[PDB]
Structures are given as structure tokens and as C-alpha cells.
Amino acid sequence: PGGLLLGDVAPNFEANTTVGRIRFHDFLGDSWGILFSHPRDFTPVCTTELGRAAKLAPEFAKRNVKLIALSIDSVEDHLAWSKDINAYNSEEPTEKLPFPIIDDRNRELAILLGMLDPAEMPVTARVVFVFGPDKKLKLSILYPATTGRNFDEILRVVISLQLTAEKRVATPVDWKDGDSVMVLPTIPEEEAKKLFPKGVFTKELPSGKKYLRYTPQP
Amino acid sequence: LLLGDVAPNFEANTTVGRIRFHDFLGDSWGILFSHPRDFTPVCTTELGRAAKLAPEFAKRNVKLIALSIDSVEDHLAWSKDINAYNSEEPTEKLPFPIIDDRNRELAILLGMLDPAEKDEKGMPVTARVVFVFGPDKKLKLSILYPATTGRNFDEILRVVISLQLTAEKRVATPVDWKDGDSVMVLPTIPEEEAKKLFPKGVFTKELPSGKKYLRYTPQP
């Protein structure tokens, strides 16, 4: 994926965006943050992705999640590209978007974030990074520019991450919002009993270990 | 690895014998599922789902393979649990192998673990990458979900379908695309060539910029 591992604290870079200069940590503050990477402006899939992210912005904001895009082009191109994005959404073709777009025409940020090789459109600059309020990397997604992301999945994964952070539960494969969840393996039996009064169900396995524990979404 | 990076041709011991990575892949696509450790809740559910879904990937020339930081012996015992999770006879027989990375060498080589491979336990929580390689051994896509957020297999199958569509029909899939929806013509392909390549019709959505990059065409 990117050059950061899970648990890595995000680079506190300074950059100029469509809304002005920003210091990464300042911008994030006490909110979760999603950084979408794109190779260049005025490009097919990336345009459909930013238009969808713009429409979905309110769903994220109410979950204390800030959105921010990065693209390897200048701010003026970013501004012009926003009218196209707005127009694609069947909206007034304005240069205003619900989130900023960082200017990385110099490719210095793409190198910092580990999604570009100087010895090589920069097709590699495609990572979606999710950071928590603690500035650490929580999740990463690396789809090529020819495969559009699925935003219902991005939203689903955010709800999951927040569930773990606040309720101390893990979500199983293909979990849908509202489904049973799993007790964190580090939670003792004595403890899980009190923490989750709704009930903890341990699936019996051949090994006899008790790690497959389900509990209603708290 | 970055997109386009060639996979390492490592040799590893697995639940089905020793393998050489590039040999294992052959002329097929390959998805490598990483797990921090055996007998873990989320990882067990994902592996169980991968086992039930193996046929769907196989008919698509996609080979499945898992890596977990534990012994092949444990991998075998864990396989009985994985089968039991699927309510099938608890044998150590799975439709795909599990690589033994008890030593942590592969995790570091694949870049999903800081070179501190000596840590007694600690739980290799960073080793959660899903790598999708093409017949050419190059990275086509990767997903990095923590061990507390189970993967979505509908999404994984959906992306394999896009990847193969781009490889074969020279088209890209827009946001939230579902198999069967309109696709987009690669920005690379000139107007002249596209009319010939996609006889089903090409639609250029007019944008404020006058640029003609938002071109759609029925899935070919």
C-alpha cells in the first residue's frame, strides 16, 4: 500500500490547497481523516470518485470524519476540475467543493507518503488513507486508477473502525451495519461478561479454544 | 510494493508442501491474504469465507493463497477450525494453502512488518495486506484492513472482475460500478480508435471544461 504501516503516525506536512495552506495535523485536529490520492486532474474514474465523495461528504462529517483529496496537478487545475466534478453531480458548476484538494504538482507529497518512485500520469499515486484522531494510520486501500472505489464500502469500514475504537469490538467478514460483532481477543472472559451484558456467544471449535465470540452490536 | 511492482519469487513452506511463489502463480491471477496469527476471530471468518468462495475465483483463473505468522503445524490445526466454522467436516483440507511465516521473514520481505522479527509475540498486527497479482506477477491492487475490520468478499470479487475487464477489454470501471453497468473508455484511447474499438457506442458527457475525458460505453 502506501509507505506507512498500520499504527504509523501521519506526516505533518504543510501544503497548499484549493482552500489555502494547511498543516496536516492542524487540519485533522480531533477528527478522523480520509486522504484520497489521484494521479492527475480531469481524469475519468477520479472524477466519478470525487463527485461521489462530495455527495457523501455529510454522511462522513456527522461521524466526525474529515475528507481531503490530493492530486498531482496545480491549484488552478484543481479549481477548474471542481466545476467539472460539480457538473458531473448535476450541480452548479462552481469551483467550491466540500473538501480541499492538495496541490502536489511537484510530487513531493506523493514521495513523502510513499506512493511514487522517482526512478520511474503517476499511476501509483492511488492510495486512500484513513487516519484516526490520534494521527495514526488505521486503514489503507490501493485501487488502480482504472478501478473505481466503492464508497459504500469506504463508509462501512469507517463505521467498523469507529465501533472498535469506542465499543471495543471487531467486525467479522462481510459485516453489515447492525449485524453481530466480535469480542476483541484480548478481552478476558470475566471482563467480556460484564462489558457486554447483552450476551457473549462462543462458537465451539475442534481446537477447544474460545476465540470465536460473538455479541450483539452494542 | 507499489502498483506494478513484481512479486518476490520466494520459497516458503505451506500446508501443502514447499512452493516457489512465481511457480505457484503460473499463468493465473493470484490473491495473497495476510493474517497476523492463527486462531484469531476475524481472520478465521475471512478464511472460512475464502474457502466457500474459492470456486468463484478459480473459474476466473484466480488462485488463492494465505499467509499467517505461525507454524505449518498450527496452520493445519487451524484449518480444522476454519472448516468447522463453515460447518463442514473438520479436516485440515482447505481449497488453498497457508504459508508458514512463523519466522516472520516473508512479512518483512513483503513490507508489512518493521524489521523487528524477533518480538516474542506482540501480535504482528501490521501484517494484514491483501495482494492481488496478475499473470505477469505484478501488483494490481492491495487492501490494508486492520485485524479488527473483517474484509468484504463481494468487494474483492467485484474488483477482480474490474481488473480483468481492464486487462481484456481496455475499459475502466467508474465509482460504485456493479458488474453489468456502463464502463468508461480509457483516457489513453483516442476518439478515432474508440469508435472502432467499441461499436456499441461511446457517449461523451459534456463538461464545463470542454475536455472529452468522461466517455462511457456499455460493458463489452
Side-chain angles (χ1 to χ4, degrees):
Chain A
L4 307 63
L5 298 180
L6 291 181
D8 277 2
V9 41
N12 193 2
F13 56 86
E14 213 278 337
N16 184 224
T17 68
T18 42
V19 299
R21 311 86 0 224
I22 68 165
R23 296 193 62 200
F24 201 41
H25 288 196
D26 300 7
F27 168 83
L28 294 180
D30 294 330
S31 314
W32 283 72
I34 300 184
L35 174 70
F36 299 89
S37 304
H38 302 273
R40 289 292 183 175
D41 290 16
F42 308 100
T43 187
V45 178
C46 294
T47 296
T48 65
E49 293 173 338
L50 250 24
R52 180 59 175 155
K55 288 275 79 57
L56 237 41
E59 280 311 297
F60 288 107
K62 76 160 143 91
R63 285 175 173 89
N64 192 41
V65 177
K66 291 177 182 171
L67 263 36
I68 188 169
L70 177 157
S71 189
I72 293 155
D73 262 329
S74 66
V75 183
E76 284 306 302
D77 280 309
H78 288 349
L79 292 173
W81 191 23
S82 295
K83 312 206 311 172
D84 278 6
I85 301 172
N86 277 140
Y88 162 85
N89 277 153
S90 303
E91 245 87 47
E92 221 196 302
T94 308
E95 300 182 333
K96 198 158 197 312
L97 232 54
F99 50 81
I101 306 183
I102 307 167
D103 177 338
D104 194 26
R105 106 266 283 188
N106 297 317
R107 301 169 181 226
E108 296 182 342
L109 266 32
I111 297 180
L112 174 61
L113 290 175
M115 56 191 178
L116 192 137
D117 185 342
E120 237 108 276
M121 54 176 86
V123 307
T124 44
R126 277 285 297 174
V127 184
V128 173
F129 302 92
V130 183
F131 305 98
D134 59 4
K135 309 309 178 302
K136 301 190 209 305
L137 195 269
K138 303 290 172 192
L139 187 318
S140 186
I141 279 174
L142 217 205
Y143 286 16
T146 42
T147 287
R149 302 162 183 144
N150 177 348
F151 273 76
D152 292 355
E153 177 59 12
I154 289 177
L155 187 40
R156 176 202 156 257
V157 126
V158 166
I159 301 176
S160 171
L161 256 20
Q162 293 181 341
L163 251 182
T164 299
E166 53 200 49
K167 310 296 186 166
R168 305 221 283 142
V169 293
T171 59
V173 256
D174 309 340
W175 171 86
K176 302 276 303 304
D177 191 15
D179 288 344
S180 267
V181 78
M182 306 188 101
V183 183
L184 292 178
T186 60
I187 301 184
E189 199 176 341
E190 329 88 74
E191 185 177 326
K193 293 161 59 180
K194 305 172 64 175
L195 228 193
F196 307 105
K198 286 189 200 311
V200 177
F201 318 94
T202 310
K203 162 67 180 171
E204 182 176 55
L205 274 350
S207 71
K209 301 169 179 297
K210 309 194 295 286
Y211 59 90
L212 244 172
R213 299 175 291 175
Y214 292 88
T215 196
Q217 184 168 316
Chain B
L1 320 183
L2 298 179
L3 291 177
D5 278 10
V6 180
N9 190 9
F10 59 76
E11 181 171 320
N13 185 210
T14 80
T15 42
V16 304
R18 282 200 186 262
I19 71 156
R20 194 70 179 188
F21 201 50
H22 291 200
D23 284 26
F24 172 74
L25 293 190
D27 299 302
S28 321
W29 285 74
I31 305 169
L32 202 173
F33 305 100
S34 302
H35 296 277
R37 178 167 293 156
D38 288 17
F39 305 107
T40 42
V42 174
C43 297
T44 297
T45 70
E46 300 169 331
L47 253 29
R49 185 67 185 133
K52 303 283 287 188
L53 232 38
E56 283 306 306
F57 286 104
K59 68 201 289 292
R60 284 185 174 77
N61 192 43
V62 173
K63 288 183 178 180
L64 264 28
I65 190 173
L67 171 155
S68 190
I69 307 187
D70 264 323
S71 277
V72 56
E73 267 209 61
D74 277 340
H75 287 353
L76 290 169
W78 189 29
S79 295
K80 302 202 302 186
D81 280 9
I82 292 163
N83 272 131
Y85 162 83
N86 283 334
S87 293
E88 260 110 42
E89 282 86 86
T91 68
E92 307 153 328
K93 262 284 297 291
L94 241 37
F96 55 81
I98 308 183
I99 300 163
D100 174 319
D101 195 25
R102 185 203 56 68
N103 209 38
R104 302 186 174 206
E105 291 196 325
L106 282 39
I108 294 169
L109 195 260
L110 284 171
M112 43 178 179
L113 190 94
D114 184 273
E117 61 162 68
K118 201 171 302 193
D119 183 15
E120 204 54 70
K121 282 300 181 179
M123 252 293 275
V125 70
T126 52
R128 276 284 291 177
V129 187
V130 181
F131 299 101
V132 181
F133 303 104
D136 59 3
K137 316 301 173 298
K138 291 172 175 54
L139 223 228
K140 297 302 188 310
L141 171 325
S142 70
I143 289 159
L144 213 210
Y145 286 10
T148 42
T149 294
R151 293 137 185 177
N152 170 354
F153 276 77
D154 284 335
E155 179 63 7
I156 293 180
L157 229 179
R158 177 218 161 230
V159 299
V160 157
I161 289 174
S162 324
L163 260 31
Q164 300 188 330
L165 237 188
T166 299
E168 292 176 39
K169 313 292 193 298
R170 297 219 286 148
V171 290
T173 53
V175 257
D176 302 355
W177 171 81
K178 279 85 187 179
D179 188 29
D181 289 348
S182 278
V183 302
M184 307 181 88
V185 334
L186 301 178
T188 310
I189 305 172
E191 187 194 304
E192 298 70 28
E193 181 175 11
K195 292 177 293 174
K196 296 315 304 172
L197 240 195
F198 308 105
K200 284 186 176 189
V202 177
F203 173 86
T204 307
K205 184 158 176 57
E206 284 311 311
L207 285 336
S209 73
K211 297 188 183 178
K212 296 169 291 174
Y213 60 90
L214 269 211
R215 300 176 290 176
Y216 293 90
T217 187
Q219 181 176 329

